Amino acid sequence: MKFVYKEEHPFEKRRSEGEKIRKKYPDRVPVIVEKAPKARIGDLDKKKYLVPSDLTVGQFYFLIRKRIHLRAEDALFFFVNNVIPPTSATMGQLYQEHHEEDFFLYIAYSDESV
């Protein structure tokens, strides 16, 4: 999957901004959230998040769930580098293992678990 955000900003601008955000908010991680290519699910109004590193992935699911106005019966899946991240992880842990070289963590969401 390609992210619109990577398609709109040259790599060097991304890395420069990511580097600065990590220095300026060391208790947080910068995260880009976009809908997966062929997913049938609501749109997400905002895609750039400055997330406390101690927030769990589970809590972030809930937060994103709310922004999309998903009902509880509705499914939501995160994908990071083709892996579904564990809900028990903190966003800081997820960020450490999966952030890209522009210092951003990219998360795709979908109604499908594949």
């Binding site: 910068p30 905002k46 998040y49 400055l50 406390p52 101690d54």
Partner: peptide, 14 residues
Amino acid sequence: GSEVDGWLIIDLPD
């Protein structure tokens, strides 16, 4: 909520 350079600042719940 609060945004800095269009980044949405997420609060840590209790």
